[PDB]
Amino acid sequence: SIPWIDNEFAYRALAHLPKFTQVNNSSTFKLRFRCPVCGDSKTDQNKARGWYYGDNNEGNIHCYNCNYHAPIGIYLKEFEPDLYREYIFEIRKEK
Amino acid sequence: MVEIILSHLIFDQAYFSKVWPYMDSEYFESGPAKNTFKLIKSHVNEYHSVPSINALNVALENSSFTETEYSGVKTLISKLADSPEDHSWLVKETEKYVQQRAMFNATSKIIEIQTNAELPPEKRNKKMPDVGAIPDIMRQALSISFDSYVGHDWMDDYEARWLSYMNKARKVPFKLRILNKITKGGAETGTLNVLMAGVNVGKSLGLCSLAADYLQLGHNVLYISMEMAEEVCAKRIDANMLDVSLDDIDDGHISYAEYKGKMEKWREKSTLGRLIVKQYPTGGADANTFRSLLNELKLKKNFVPTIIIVDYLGICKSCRIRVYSENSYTTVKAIAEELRALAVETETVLWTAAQVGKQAWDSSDVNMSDIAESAGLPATADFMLAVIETEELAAAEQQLIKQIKSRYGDKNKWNKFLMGVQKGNQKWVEIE
Amino acid sequence: MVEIILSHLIFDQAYFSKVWPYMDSEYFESGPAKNTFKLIKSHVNEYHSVPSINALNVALENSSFTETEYSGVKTLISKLADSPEDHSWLVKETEKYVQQRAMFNATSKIIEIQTNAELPPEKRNKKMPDVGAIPDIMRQALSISFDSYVGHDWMDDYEARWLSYMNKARKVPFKLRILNKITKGGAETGTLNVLMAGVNVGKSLGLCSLAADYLQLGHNVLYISMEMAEEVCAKRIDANMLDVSLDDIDDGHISYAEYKGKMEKWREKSTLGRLIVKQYPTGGADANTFRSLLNELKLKKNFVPTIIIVDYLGICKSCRIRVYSENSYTTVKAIAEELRALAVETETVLWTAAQVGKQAWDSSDVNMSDIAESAGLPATADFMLAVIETEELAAAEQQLIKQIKSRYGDKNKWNKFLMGVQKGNQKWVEIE
Amino acid sequence: MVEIILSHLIFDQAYFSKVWPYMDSEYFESGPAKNTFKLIKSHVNEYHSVPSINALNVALENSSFTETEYSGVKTLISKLADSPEDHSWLVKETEKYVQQRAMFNATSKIIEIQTNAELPPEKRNKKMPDVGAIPDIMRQALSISFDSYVGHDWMDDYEARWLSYMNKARKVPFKLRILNKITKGGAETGTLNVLMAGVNVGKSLGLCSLAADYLQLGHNVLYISMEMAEEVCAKRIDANMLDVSLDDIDDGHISYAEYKGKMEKWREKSTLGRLIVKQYPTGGADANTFRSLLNELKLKKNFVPTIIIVDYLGICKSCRIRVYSENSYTTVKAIAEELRALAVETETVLWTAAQVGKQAWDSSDVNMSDIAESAGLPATADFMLAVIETEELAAAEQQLIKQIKSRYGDKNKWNKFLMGVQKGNQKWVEIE
Amino acid sequence: MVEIILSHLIFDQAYFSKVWPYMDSEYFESGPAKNTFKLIKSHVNEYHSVPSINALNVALENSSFTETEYSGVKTLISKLADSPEDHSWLVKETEKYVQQRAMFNATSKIIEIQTNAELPPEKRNKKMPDVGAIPDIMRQALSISFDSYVGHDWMDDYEARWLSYMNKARKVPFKLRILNKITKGGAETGTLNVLMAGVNVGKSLGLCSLAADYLQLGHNVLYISMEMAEEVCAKRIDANMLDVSLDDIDDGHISYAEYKGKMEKWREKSTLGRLIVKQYPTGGADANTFRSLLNELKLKKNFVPTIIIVDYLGICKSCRIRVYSENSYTTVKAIAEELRALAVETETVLWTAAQVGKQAWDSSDVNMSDIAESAGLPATADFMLAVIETEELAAAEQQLIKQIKSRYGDKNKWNKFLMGVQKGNQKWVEIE
DNA sequence: TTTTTTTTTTTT
DNA sequence: GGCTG
Ligand SMILES: Nc1ncnc2c1ncn2[C@@H]1O[C@H](COP(=O)(O)OP(=O)(O)OP(O)(O)=S)[C@@H](O)[C@H]1O
Ligand SMILES: Nc1ncnc2c1ncn2[C@@H]1O[C@H](COP(=O)(O)OP(=O)(O)OP(O)(O)=S)[C@@H](O)[C@H]1O
Ligand SMILES: Nc1ncnc2c1ncn2[C@@H]1O[C@H](COP(=O)(O)OP(=O)(O)OP(O)(O)=S)[C@@H](O)[C@H]1O
Ligand SMILES: [Mg+2]
Ligand SMILES: [Mg+2]
Ligand SMILES: [Mg+2]
């Protein structure tokens, strides 16, 4: 897989999601966001349990509220198809 | 224009009648555009009528998707409203939209297949089609035009039907007179013909004799061997054409001068096609493999066959069922159906061999019930011929061919005749 | 959907005549909905008619409620419109709503019973039932379906039953006197009729003969081919109708003049119907495809078929089960059930063929147990005849037809009768 | 009182001997209690003795528990002590606690079932029982008690055996004396009786004959037909009772005057019941629908049946299992259990007709290894008969009954007897 | 666990005599536990007896330990109690502790050996074993078991085996002199014994006679019936035990007073066992359901049987075969193997019956070849008694018992013997 | 747990 | 204020 293009594409997709924070240390890339599937916690409006982990072989999104866990490609295919088109093309561009 | 399509699916009976049969869930936005259409499709499947706004709202309330999806569907439903329109602009625009979405989905799937096949094995996410069926998918993206063919009318369309009887381009004549007589003009294109003999009775000698006879009658023949080398089949064809026994070739009783002279004499004759022999490992070729072979033959070798021959269908792999998943019956029936589909697709006479059961071996008669691997093969085959050899027949250099399934004519007439197989020359000769 | 239920109670008599029998204040809510339904019930009790909006508002003014409930009832009453939704969907949805509310009430009741049981005997209420009443309470809430029809009575409805005896509109004659004799007036609409035999015995011959016989009687016949091409089957129909031959068509013995003359003479007949032949790839169609084909046929041409012939049920594809999800006994029976459902929906006589296992391919007789596919097909079938051909029969050109499953009449009155099958003309000839 | 239960399981022996076989892990909360009971149960299973405090502290250390679970279990073990009380209050208090826990678990389970049912398809959980299974669960929880009967204990249960010797259950007599002979006076009230047979051999003929015989004896008979129209079943009954062949009725040989005269002559007889025929679509009726039908029959027609007859068991809905969830065996067994429960609840003799397998078709003898859908039907049934009209009984206008399972008497006394089936009148006559 | 081990070394005798030879210093610790065990071992070596607490403290006072060691040993000595745990659990747990510690020590030793091996050869310890000694060392860790009993060791268990031959530890008498004569003292535990019934002999009469005889001898009998209810089998038992004829109970000749008096007279006798009759449907009880029944009886009824009598082997179901046939050889062979495995694993005498071959039915003599179950029952049966009932024997109220297979003793010693069968009381009496 | 094809084997 | 597989 190609991790840096997943980090670049994931950011834009999760940028729309509110409570968006870039948890980027010296060796990892994570994105904190409110989960778009369930709206995260109904009681707490300030909780961002949706996370993106791009330091692995494949950048994966995981929600700690509704237990959603998916790759960034499936997330883009299911929710942002205009972003999904260029994502797989830039993927083909470098592959 | 998804909102217009949904609105006129709801508030237009004429629009729904034409567009609905073709509308599919993969042609709108994955979100409400898809959720709203899924609601409508479920209502139509449950009640066979177009839902109203109240029905859509009720189905929306009795739905399990999240708050974002619920709000999107509610907004989309609230935005649906009938507008003064004309049937033509809507049908044409819907056709354009459906074609564009089909092309988009097809190219997305093509990219997915390409990026999946370029992965190390055992991690390639199986059940995804291989690159071989990349163009076929695109061919499915172009066959969507809101113009489904209802069918053929007996009385309305009979001039076109009559201009198919003297055409005779469907039938490909044999070279033996008896086979033409029983088939009333030879085999037909887009069919699946089968030879049932047993083990070491014939059944590849007959296929080679047919290939040679078709080759002499200006035909392009594609022999496909799943159990023999390309040089063994070519040696059989050489023995048939050059009238030199296989023993003479093995024992070196034919010189290079005679071989060269016979080959050049055959080449200089105008009435001769091209025969190409291709070998695949047993259980390693299917209909998709044969289509890829056809494409690469057309491109690289400008070779367009009409008499495609497969040595044994039972030795081939199904292109749909996973290996050793279903029993022999289902697998062999599927393989035969796929081969017949290939034959009708490329409009070629397809010839194949089939084994008989152990009980039919060394028997003076072979029935249709003696088919080995599946009872569906006789049902999905246009013509079948049973090759029977006994000790008396072997001593007479003859074999009894019984018409088991004769779809081109009446099998009761000329059911059993004696061919003069010559095993040294791999040739069938008549007795008339 | 309480608003819809109340609106169609007030503004629809047909809805009121099927739901009011089964309706209670506990089913709706504890707020404005229950109060509105209580007003409706009080008005209908005092005056045996459905109230109007003005009458309901006057009653609300007369009745006493607190401020909140008064405002809620006024707001809810303001929201009532005719909104002519479909009757079937409305009754199904209100049945579902009643069932779910009744289940919720029953669960709350049993929870209250359990809570009261744990209380000390002095504190506990004697009105609530014991725990032993938990099961039946949950059962009476599962028997609240909307169905007022109790059924026949055999003594209070014998006049209506006798009138039904005179309704012979379901029967469709056969054009063959023996088939009418054994079916007591021909086949019936909405029934699954099967013509089974071995491989290459004349199943499609019999189907085309039935199609031609129904065509000559003025019926609309829809022939759905699964193996042969449209022009091939139409050739068999031409051989049956024009009555010349199958080989003479392909051997040029018929001059165009004769073909045109015979076709125009058949066109001049006012007793002729319409025949449409549709071909599908093997394993790619079912009632879901057939229903769309029916809709397209009705839209494009004034063609509503009375007879629907399917070339083979086995070659067909089930709607819910995938191509190879389950074994033969299931998906074949599923396809049979779907075809019978399609026939009873369209009120058409459905004909199809069935294959016989290898055990009876060369036997003088065939039984019901000799069905190649699932044995559920000879459970959904209604008139499963059987075609048996031997050497003696083929010598006399007389196939034997055995009555295998006879739902219309007595299966054993004429169990085995000889036909006069002419294979060249693709015609069944009665024997006298 | 979980702490007391654990303390007296550890420190008391008579209490342990009395209550241990009925304790279960589901009766304890998920905190320290369930883990402590798990340790105790594992120790008892491994050493067949009650563990001490040291044993459990050793088992706790040798356990895969989290810090919270470990601390809770250790605290609970420390809190245990042998409080001296009476071994007559402890047992009843433990029984009450176990019953309350069982009721709580059943309530939670049915709430989960109802939540699962409302979910849309392709998302709802599979293998989870449907809504109709809710009462049965609630029937199981109420049956929990510290008294268990496993088998019949000689010298310990002999008063009940003497009662069984001296007393005989009430019997609803047949009209055929042979059935009374083989059943010692008829069939009991709360029973499920099955008349298995092959396809198109007289499943409905026998059921209609039984319905007519019971109707002539003054019983209220409900005929639930799942495959045939109401008029067809009522016509079978008319042929049975009016002594007119079905051929005569269809052909119109009998006039309306004769039909009315015979019907009124039957009406004037005091020894006549009421027969009500209700038709349901295939797979559209279940036990709860039957209960709703019974309720509406009682309320709107003052009709309480005794001889409820179901045409075919294999077509009815499961009422406990979602459609197309389990295999045929499990679904048919569930249907049989539901129907027998309905018969017991309504105190009605219930008669049905299952279908035998393809092997039993045209077989001169059948056994329990011939039932097609489910071999668990005999276990659930109370009397099961068979029909063996295969080849020569039809020519002789006779039948044969195997008596596969007879709980009313002994099956190996009159196991096979010949029945004079008359198909024109749809009745059974005796050969005597 | 170490505290318990030390405490029960100090305060027990059987535990000490059982576990002392397998106790080593390296098994405990490197701290207080090791020092305490060293004190115990030193005391037992100097004085061959278990030390007391005061003696242990005196030894600790007169010992070379530091302050921390002194404190640890003093605390551990003060933490030892004479509490009474069960012996089996204590031995098993200390065996597990010893095995775990030995495995840990061996693993650490091999790791240290490997670490020393990867060191400059000039610089390494000589005392450390070479790498090639690693597989043996682990073996010494795996060869640690407090008690070694793997099978029967000839020449090492001859004294125990002789106590078996003199005490007849395996034999179970018959109460019939002839049956004890031919079995050398009765049947054996863990055996399958079957009766072969010719035409005209019942299979349940002999089984009920054996059950009654075992009941009168004090054995717990579990009678599992297939074709009969619990009451009927217990009625046969009553007929044999109370001397009342079977038909007299049904007629009513015997009154409740005599029945109760005889039952209480039997109950007064202390030489009477318990009989538990359990009924199962035909084909619904494999030899895995019997295991569950035994578990339930042991847990709830505390009933652990010594005799298990199955009504009929043929009616049972083969768990391994799964599929069920009315009369199939493969199932009977599997059923016999499963029942004999159950008998072996439960240490019970298992009885069953079968029908002899038709040829055996006609012939008074029955050959192992003349058996319905051939090579299946005379291969898995320790004893197979054959019962012959001819006309002359029936007229004399007798049955000829023939011995067809006797694993117990010589088959030809006393092969034929006449038995006094009473069919009314269901009894076998001897013949002088 | 049944169902259906094909084969191979074996038992009666 | 982070936490998955
Ligand atoms: N090299 C050869 N020389 C002479 N005769 C041969 C030679 N090869 C085959 N034959 C003869 O041809 C007969 C049939 O050959 P084939 O066509 O290979 O039989 P087959 O049925 O195709 O074999 P299988 O079992 O289907 S792979 C044999 O029985 C031989 O008598
Ligand atoms: N072109 C033809 N000319 C003459 N007779 C023919 C011709 N085609 C078929 N037949 C005869 O038709 C008989 C059976 O016809 P079919 O319809 O092929 O039987 P069927 O195989 O059961 O039907 P299918 O498989 O759906 S085509 C054969 O035995 C032939 O005798
Ligand atoms: N109209 C009729 N006139 C005379 N005999 C008939 C008539 N209808 C049916 N029969 C006969 O009645 C027999 C039994 O039919 P059914 O009562 O339907 O048995 P069945 O088991 O219910 O059939 P199914 O439901 O399709 S499996 C048939 O085999 C026919 O011989
Ligand atoms: Mg070959
Ligand atoms: Mg065919
Ligand atoms: Mg019926």
mmCIF file of N, CA and C in Angstrom, chain B residues 17 43 47 52 54 148-155 158-159 161-162 165 168 320-321 330 333-334 337 340 367-369 371 375 378 407 411-412, chain C residues 85 89 93 199-200 227-228 230-231 234 238 249-250 254 256 259-260 264 267 275-278 282 296 299 301 323-324 358 361-362 373 394:
data_model
loop_
_atom_site.group_PDB
_atom_site.id
_atom_site.type_symbol
_atom_site.label_atom_id
_atom_site.label_comp_id
_atom_site.label_asym_id
_atom_site.label_seq_id
_atom_site.Cartn_x
_atom_site.Cartn_y
_atom_site.Cartn_z
ATOM 1 N N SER B 17 -42.940 3.623 -15.983
ATOM 2 C CA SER B 17 -43.122 2.391 -16.792
ATOM 3 C C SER B 17 -41.872 2.105 -17.632
ATOM 4 N N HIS B 43 -40.200 -0.549 -1.349
ATOM 5 C CA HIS B 43 -41.646 -0.358 -1.391
ATOM 6 C C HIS B 43 -42.249 -0.967 -2.650
ATOM 7 N N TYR B 47 -45.059 -3.903 -2.584
ATOM 8 C CA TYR B 47 -46.436 -3.568 -2.922
ATOM 9 C C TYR B 47 -46.702 -3.392 -4.410
ATOM 10 N N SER B 52 -45.841 6.994 -2.192
ATOM 11 C CA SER B 52 -46.108 8.414 -2.070
ATOM 12 C C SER B 52 -45.123 9.041 -1.083
ATOM 13 N N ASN B 54 -45.897 10.318 1.840
ATOM 14 C CA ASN B 54 -46.213 9.776 3.157
ATOM 15 C C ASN B 54 -45.623 8.383 3.337
ATOM 16 N N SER B 148 -34.542 -2.560 -24.604
ATOM 17 C CA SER B 148 -34.565 -4.010 -24.456
ATOM 18 C C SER B 148 -35.407 -4.648 -25.554
ATOM 19 N N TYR B 149 -34.875 -5.714 -26.148
ATOM 20 C CA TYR B 149 -35.559 -6.422 -27.221
ATOM 21 C C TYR B 149 -36.613 -7.347 -26.624
ATOM 22 N N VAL B 150 -37.883 -7.071 -26.928
ATOM 23 C CA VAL B 150 -38.976 -7.832 -26.329
ATOM 24 C C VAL B 150 -38.939 -9.288 -26.778
ATOM 25 N N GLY B 151 -38.697 -9.526 -28.057
ATOM 26 C CA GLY B 151 -38.636 -10.876 -28.577
ATOM 27 C C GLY B 151 -38.998 -10.899 -30.047
ATOM 28 N N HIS B 152 -39.186 -12.114 -30.551
ATOM 29 C CA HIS B 152 -39.491 -12.360 -31.955
ATOM 30 C C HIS B 152 -40.960 -12.734 -32.094
ATOM 31 N N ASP B 153 -41.668 -12.029 -32.973
ATOM 32 C CA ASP B 153 -43.078 -12.286 -33.232
ATOM 33 C C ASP B 153 -43.207 -13.190 -34.451
ATOM 34 N N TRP B 154 -44.037 -14.230 -34.328
ATOM 35 C CA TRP B 154 -44.145 -15.225 -35.388
ATOM 36 C C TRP B 154 -44.728 -14.632 -36.664
ATOM 37 N N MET B 155 -45.784 -13.829 -36.542
ATOM 38 C CA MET B 155 -46.472 -13.295 -37.712
ATOM 39 C C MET B 155 -45.938 -11.932 -38.131
ATOM 40 N N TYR B 158 -41.692 -12.343 -40.108
ATOM 41 C CA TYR B 158 -41.470 -13.597 -40.817
ATOM 42 C C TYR B 158 -40.679 -13.445 -42.106
ATOM 43 N N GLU B 159 -40.590 -12.245 -42.685
ATOM 44 C CA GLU B 159 -39.670 -12.036 -43.796
ATOM 45 C C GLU B 159 -38.224 -12.159 -43.337
ATOM 46 N N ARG B 161 -37.274 -13.890 -40.789
ATOM 47 C CA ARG B 161 -37.098 -15.309 -40.497
ATOM 48 C C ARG B 161 -36.856 -16.111 -41.768
ATOM 49 N N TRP B 162 -37.610 -15.823 -42.833
ATOM 50 C CA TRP B 162 -37.402 -16.535 -44.088
ATOM 51 C C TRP B 162 -36.054 -16.200 -44.699
ATOM 52 N N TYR B 165 -33.199 -19.128 -44.003
ATOM 53 C CA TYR B 165 -33.287 -20.529 -44.391
ATOM 54 C C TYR B 165 -32.386 -20.878 -45.566
ATOM 55 N N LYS B 168 -27.890 -20.294 -44.992
ATOM 56 C CA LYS B 168 -27.082 -21.487 -44.754
ATOM 57 C C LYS B 168 -25.669 -21.174 -44.279
ATOM 58 N N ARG B 320 -16.495 -20.285 -13.256
ATOM 59 C CA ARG B 320 -17.453 -19.682 -12.292
ATOM 60 C C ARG B 320 -17.418 -20.439 -10.963
ATOM 61 N N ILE B 321 -17.258 -21.761 -10.993
ATOM 62 C CA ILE B 321 -17.317 -22.520 -9.752
ATOM 63 C C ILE B 321 -15.894 -22.761 -9.272
ATOM 64 N N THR B 330 -22.669 -30.866 -11.319
ATOM 65 C CA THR B 330 -22.798 -29.420 -11.458
ATOM 66 C C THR B 330 -21.598 -28.819 -12.181
ATOM 67 N N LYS B 333 -21.638 -29.782 -15.937
ATOM 68 C CA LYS B 333 -22.718 -29.069 -16.612
ATOM 69 C C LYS B 333 -22.359 -27.603 -16.813
ATOM 70 N N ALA B 334 -21.776 -26.971 -15.793
ATOM 71 C CA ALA B 334 -21.368 -25.576 -15.918
ATOM 72 C C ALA B 334 -20.291 -25.408 -16.981
ATOM 73 N N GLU B 337 -21.903 -25.703 -20.397
ATOM 74 C CA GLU B 337 -22.696 -24.515 -20.695
ATOM 75 C C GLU B 337 -21.806 -23.332 -21.054
ATOM 76 N N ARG B 340 -20.468 -23.846 -24.559
ATOM 77 C CA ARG B 340 -21.497 -23.538 -25.549
ATOM 78 C C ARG B 340 -21.714 -22.035 -25.663
ATOM 79 N N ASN B 367 -24.864 -46.576 -24.251
ATOM 80 C CA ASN B 367 -26.081 -45.786 -24.172
ATOM 81 C C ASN B 367 -25.771 -44.375 -23.685
ATOM 82 N N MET B 368 -26.766 -43.496 -23.825
ATOM 83 C CA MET B 368 -26.608 -42.119 -23.365
ATOM 84 C C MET B 368 -26.453 -42.049 -21.853
ATOM 85 N N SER B 369 -27.040 -43.004 -21.127
ATOM 86 C CA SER B 369 -26.921 -43.045 -19.675
ATOM 87 C C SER B 369 -25.524 -43.428 -19.209
ATOM 88 N N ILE B 371 -22.834 -41.815 -19.903
ATOM 89 C CA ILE B 371 -21.982 -40.640 -19.791
ATOM 90 C C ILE B 371 -21.359 -40.600 -18.404
ATOM 91 N N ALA B 375 -24.890 -35.975 -16.099
ATOM 92 C CA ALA B 375 -26.056 -36.158 -16.951
ATOM 93 C C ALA B 375 -26.498 -34.867 -17.625
ATOM 94 N N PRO B 378 -25.246 -34.219 -21.812
ATOM 95 C CA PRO B 378 -26.147 -34.490 -22.944
ATOM 96 C C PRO B 378 -27.256 -33.464 -23.088
ATOM 97 N N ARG B 407 -29.368 -33.390 -32.538
ATOM 98 C CA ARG B 407 -30.252 -32.235 -32.551
ATOM 99 C C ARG B 407 -30.474 -31.663 -33.944
ATOM 100 N N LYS B 411 -32.542 -38.984 -34.876
ATOM 101 C CA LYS B 411 -31.478 -39.938 -34.486
ATOM 102 C C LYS B 411 -31.915 -41.368 -34.802
ATOM 103 N N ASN B 412 -33.217 -41.626 -34.872
ATOM 104 C CA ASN B 412 -33.675 -43.019 -35.104
ATOM 105 C C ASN B 412 -33.166 -43.463 -36.475
ATOM 106 N N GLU C 85 -53.729 7.405 -0.336
ATOM 107 C CA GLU C 85 -52.681 6.411 -0.482
ATOM 108 C C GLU C 85 -53.269 5.066 -0.909
ATOM 109 N N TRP C 89 -51.081 -1.113 0.934
ATOM 110 C CA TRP C 89 -49.989 -0.637 1.773
ATOM 111 C C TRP C 89 -50.516 -0.071 3.079
ATOM 112 N N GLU C 93 -49.486 -1.557 6.671
ATOM 113 C CA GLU C 93 -48.749 -0.708 7.597
ATOM 114 C C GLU C 93 -49.495 -0.541 8.911
ATOM 115 N N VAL C 199 -33.542 -36.963 -22.256
ATOM 116 C CA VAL C 199 -32.794 -36.085 -23.149
ATOM 117 C C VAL C 199 -33.036 -36.516 -24.590
ATOM 118 N N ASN C 200 -33.382 -35.544 -25.441
ATOM 119 C CA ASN C 200 -33.616 -35.769 -26.869
ATOM 120 C C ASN C 200 -34.793 -36.719 -27.093
ATOM 121 N N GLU C 227 -32.359 -22.538 -24.304
ATOM 122 C CA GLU C 227 -31.229 -23.129 -25.011
ATOM 123 C C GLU C 227 -31.200 -22.751 -26.481
ATOM 124 N N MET C 228 -32.325 -22.867 -27.180
ATOM 125 C CA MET C 228 -32.353 -22.625 -28.613
ATOM 126 C C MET C 228 -32.502 -21.138 -28.912
ATOM 127 N N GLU C 230 -34.136 -17.850 -31.115
ATOM 128 C CA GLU C 230 -35.505 -17.463 -31.445
ATOM 129 C C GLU C 230 -35.912 -17.977 -32.819
ATOM 130 N N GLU C 231 -35.003 -17.911 -33.792
ATOM 131 C CA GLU C 231 -35.341 -18.343 -35.144
ATOM 132 C C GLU C 231 -35.466 -19.859 -35.237
ATOM 133 N N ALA C 234 -38.932 -20.733 -33.778
ATOM 134 C CA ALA C 234 -39.915 -20.258 -34.742
ATOM 135 C C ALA C 234 -39.953 -21.144 -35.977
ATOM 136 N N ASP C 238 -43.245 -22.900 -37.341
ATOM 137 C CA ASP C 238 -43.613 -22.848 -38.751
ATOM 138 C C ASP C 238 -43.859 -24.243 -39.310
ATOM 139 N N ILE C 249 -37.793 -27.315 -45.080
ATOM 140 C CA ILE C 249 -37.488 -25.901 -44.893
ATOM 141 C C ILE C 249 -36.012 -25.637 -45.160
ATOM 142 N N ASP C 250 -35.141 -26.508 -44.656
ATOM 143 C CA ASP C 250 -33.701 -26.354 -44.822
ATOM 144 C C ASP C 250 -33.176 -26.951 -46.122
ATOM 145 N N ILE C 254 -39.432 -25.782 -50.170
ATOM 146 C CA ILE C 254 -40.552 -24.800 -50.043
ATOM 147 C C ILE C 254 -40.207 -23.537 -50.838
ATOM 148 N N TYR C 256 -40.551 -19.710 -51.946
ATOM 149 C CA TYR C 256 -40.991 -18.502 -51.201
ATOM 150 C C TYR C 256 -42.484 -18.264 -51.451
ATOM 151 N N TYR C 259 -44.470 -20.202 -49.063
ATOM 152 C CA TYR C 259 -44.304 -19.706 -47.701
ATOM 153 C C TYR C 259 -45.122 -18.440 -47.477
ATOM 154 N N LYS C 260 -45.014 -17.480 -48.400
ATOM 155 C CA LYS C 260 -45.796 -16.255 -48.300
ATOM 156 C C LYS C 260 -47.287 -16.546 -48.353
ATOM 157 N N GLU C 264 -49.807 -15.682 -45.270
ATOM 158 C CA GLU C 264 -50.910 -14.744 -45.454
ATOM 159 C C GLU C 264 -52.257 -15.416 -45.220
ATOM 160 N N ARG C 267 -52.684 -15.436 -41.658
ATOM 161 C CA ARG C 267 -52.992 -14.080 -41.211
ATOM 162 C C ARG C 267 -54.465 -13.752 -41.423
ATOM 163 N N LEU C 275 -47.963 -14.848 -31.060
ATOM 164 C CA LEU C 275 -46.890 -15.649 -30.492
ATOM 165 C C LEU C 275 -45.604 -14.838 -30.472
ATOM 166 N N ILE C 276 -44.995 -14.727 -29.293
ATOM 167 C CA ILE C 276 -43.728 -14.028 -29.113
ATOM 168 C C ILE C 276 -42.721 -15.017 -28.541
ATOM 169 N N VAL C 277 -41.559 -15.117 -29.183
ATOM 170 C CA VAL C 277 -40.493 -16.020 -28.767
ATOM 171 C C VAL C 277 -39.361 -15.179 -28.196
ATOM 172 N N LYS C 278 -38.965 -15.482 -26.963
ATOM 173 C CA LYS C 278 -37.891 -14.775 -26.282
ATOM 174 C C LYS C 278 -36.842 -15.776 -25.825
ATOM 175 N N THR C 282 -28.437 -19.351 -20.680
ATOM 176 C CA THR C 282 -28.646 -20.374 -19.663
ATOM 177 C C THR C 282 -28.310 -19.835 -18.278
ATOM 178 N N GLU C 296 -42.763 -4.960 -20.265
ATOM 179 C CA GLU C 296 -42.265 -4.400 -21.517
ATOM 180 C C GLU C 296 -43.104 -4.859 -22.702
ATOM 181 N N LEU C 299 -46.387 -2.891 -22.606
ATOM 182 C CA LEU C 299 -46.199 -1.493 -22.988
ATOM 183 C C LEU C 299 -45.947 -1.353 -24.484
ATOM 184 N N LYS C 301 -46.410 -3.514 -27.073
ATOM 185 C CA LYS C 301 -47.445 -4.047 -27.946
ATOM 186 C C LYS C 301 -48.637 -4.487 -27.108
ATOM 187 N N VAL C 323 -26.502 -18.436 -7.792
ATOM 188 C CA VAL C 323 -26.346 -19.402 -8.875
ATOM 189 C C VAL C 323 -26.001 -20.784 -8.326
ATOM 190 N N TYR C 324 -25.153 -20.849 -7.300
ATOM 191 C CA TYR C 324 -24.774 -22.120 -6.688
ATOM 192 C C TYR C 324 -24.742 -22.001 -5.171
ATOM 193 N N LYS C 358 -30.785 -40.399 -15.218
ATOM 194 C CA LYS C 358 -30.283 -41.398 -16.160
ATOM 195 C C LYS C 358 -30.904 -42.772 -15.950
ATOM 196 N N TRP C 361 -33.724 -43.148 -18.654
ATOM 197 C CA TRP C 361 -33.512 -42.653 -20.008
ATOM 198 C C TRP C 361 -33.739 -43.726 -21.065
ATOM 199 N N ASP C 362 -33.657 -45.005 -20.696
ATOM 200 C CA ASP C 362 -33.865 -46.097 -21.640
ATOM 201 C C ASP C 362 -34.906 -47.091 -21.134
ATOM 202 N N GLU C 373 -34.057 -33.181 -11.337
ATOM 203 C CA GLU C 373 -33.860 -32.092 -10.393
ATOM 204 C C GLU C 373 -34.669 -32.381 -9.127
ATOM 205 N N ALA C 394 -40.924 -45.735 -31.511
ATOM 206 C CA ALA C 394 -40.310 -44.925 -32.558
ATOM 207 C C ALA C 394 -40.528 -45.536 -33.936
#
